[PDB]
Amino acid sequence: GSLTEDGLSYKEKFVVRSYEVGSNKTATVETIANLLQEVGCNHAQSVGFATTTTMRKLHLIWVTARMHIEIYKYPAWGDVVEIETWCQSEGRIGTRRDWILKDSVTGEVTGRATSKWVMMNQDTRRLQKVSDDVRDEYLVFCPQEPRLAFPEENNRSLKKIPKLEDPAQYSMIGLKPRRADLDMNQHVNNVTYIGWVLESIPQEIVDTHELQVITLDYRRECQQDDVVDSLTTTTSDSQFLHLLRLSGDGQEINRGTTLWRKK
Amino acid sequence: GSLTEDGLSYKEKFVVRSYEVGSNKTATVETIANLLQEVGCNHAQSVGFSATTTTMRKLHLIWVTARMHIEIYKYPAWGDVVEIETWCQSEGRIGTRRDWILKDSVTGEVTGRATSKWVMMNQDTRRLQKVSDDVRDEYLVFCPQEPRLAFPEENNRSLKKIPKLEDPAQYSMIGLKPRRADLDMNQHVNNVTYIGWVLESIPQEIVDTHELQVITLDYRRECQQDDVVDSLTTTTSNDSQFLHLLRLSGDGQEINRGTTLWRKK
Numbered sequence A: 001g002s003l004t005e006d007g008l009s010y011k012e013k014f015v016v017r018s019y020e021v022g023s024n025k026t027a028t029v030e031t032i033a034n035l036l037q038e039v040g041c042n043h044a045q046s047v048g049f050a051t052t053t054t055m056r057k058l059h060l061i062w063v064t065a066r067m068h069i070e071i072y073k074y075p076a077w078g079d080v081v082e083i084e085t086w087c088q089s090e091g092r093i094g095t096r097r098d099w100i101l102k103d104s105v106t107g108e109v110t111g112r113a114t115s116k117w118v119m120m121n122q123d124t125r126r127l128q129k130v131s132d133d134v135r136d137e138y139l140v141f142c143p144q145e146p147r148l149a150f151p152e153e154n155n156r157s158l159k160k161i162p163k164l165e166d167p168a169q170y171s172m173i174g175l176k177p178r179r180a181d182l183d184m185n186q187h188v189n190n191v192t193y194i195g196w197v198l199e200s201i202p203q204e205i206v207d208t209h210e211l212q213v214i215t216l217d218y219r220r221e222c223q224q225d226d227v228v229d230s231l232t233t234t235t236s237d238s239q240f241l242h243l244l245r246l247s248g249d250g251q252e253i254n255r256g257t258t259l260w261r262k263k
Numbered sequence B: 001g002s003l004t005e006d007g008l009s010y011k012e013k014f015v016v017r018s019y020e021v022g023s024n025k026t027a028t029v030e031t032i033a034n035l036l037q038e039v040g041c042n043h044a045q046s047v048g049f050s051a052t053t054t055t056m057r058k059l060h061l062i063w064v065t066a067r068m069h070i071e072i073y074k075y076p077a078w079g080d081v082v083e084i085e086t087w088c089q090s091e092g093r094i095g096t097r098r099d100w101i102l103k104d105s106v107t108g109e110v111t112g113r114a115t116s117k118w119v120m121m122n123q124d125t126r127r128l129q130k131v132s133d134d135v136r137d138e139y140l141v142f143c144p145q146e147p148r149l150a151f152p153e154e155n156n157r158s159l160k161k162i163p164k165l166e167d168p169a170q171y172s173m174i175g176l177k178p179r180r181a182d183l184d185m186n187q188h189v190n191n192v193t194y195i196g197w198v199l200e201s202i203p204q205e206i207v208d209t210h211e212l213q214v215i216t217l218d219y220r221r222e223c224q225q226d227d228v229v230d231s232l233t234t235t236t237s238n239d240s241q242f243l244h245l246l247r248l249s250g251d252g253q254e255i256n257r258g259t260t261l262w263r264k265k
């Protein structure tokens, strides 16, 4: 993997592995989600840096508020996929990472992604606007003119997700993370939530359709002795409305929607 | 990804990824477990397999994993390249063996070694059988002929009989169940998932203050749709040893038994 000629984006090549694919022998969206995580990490390494700089000074971290993924073709087992990624200021409101996936044999786009990150405090968890000296550390590693994997004005990735109302059409109750769901700081990694959201999609739908789009808001963390319930309801191509909530008091941790095409 | 000069062994290089490491920024045994699986798969393809022979596909026969044994000296750090060599051998009519060496790509030193016992089973009836000469011949031409053992030792902890755990268990993790990321391409629970289930009953205290040196795990039954697992661990003991049992939380049917051996950091 490497920074491009201008050092304002990063590329990496991945070979899809045997345990990385589902029953179509194409990559799961979770594998895809982990390669974006991975390529985003190596791009932080390359520049100097989760990707903190003048943040751990005041005990501050970046944290995913929203993931959005559109897949045209899921790479097959043995296929090389190329992912290019870059980061942009959304002023002091925001901070965005976009990805592009290409077939490394055709150079053709098979998938694109985008995400929103905000400041916190690993301790108090309180949201924080981005200061001047925080935009003087990373904005030298970012494109200055807007560059959007989702350019389209009023599209699928900027719009409000409603809260699923009881009763839910479908549910998988009592989901618990294991140690393999934890990152190196012992937090459930953003990708397990994607897994829990998809767990309440019926097998009939997975077996006959293909996931075209996922959109996931990150509202609260699950703390490895919390148990999640996962709720889905057909809102409709099939579309679903998603809610993850703590098994007990019913506290929201994620809401999302998904969009499937008939195979 | 290539067969060696003599095409009786296969080598692959893996770079350790961010989401593949634990609290020490070194790869988890499960990540190791997955790279051993990935490299075994690429070696089957390399000699033209899928790892069923011509006869096996005809007779609805598959290779199943009876025992996994893994000994790690050093877990490769996030960003480190790791080289794994793997090879198979006839264990006569009983079944096959697959053996792995893990090396550091920079120093060339062994950092781990694994070994496994594969038995032949009917897909459908789920019924073990011995290796017909018709089959032995089809894969023997892809195996070393002189024994080549990752675990040569005259009394190695890879071939020793594992007791069943007596109730009450010292530790337990109750109600474990697979999600879709736990399934392989043919919709069966991935063999690595049981490693993680086994290790869920090891208390955090041990994990935070020791390293896993040795895991030995026998496979007795699989998780066959809607099943829920309980995980049982009891200390059998510098070195902490454990005895392990997985069972279906209903009838209490055994699926796995195992041991682990941890050293203080």
Ligand SMILES: CCN(C)C(=O)c1cccc(N)c1
Residues within 6 Å of the ligand: A063, A064, A065, A066, A118, A190, A218, A219, A220, A221, A222, A253
């Ligand atoms: C799994 C990580 N999550 C959900 C968070 O820590 C979090 C909490 C509040 C707001 C946001 N954006 C994120």
Ligand SMILES: CCN(C)C(=O)c1cccc(N)c1
Residues within 6 Å of the ligand: B064, B065, B066, B067, B188, B189, B190, B191, B218, B219, B220, B221, B222, B223, B255
């Ligand atoms: C998923 C792998 N497992 C547990 C099996 O299919 C199995 C069943 C019986 C004996 C053995 N050795 C393995």
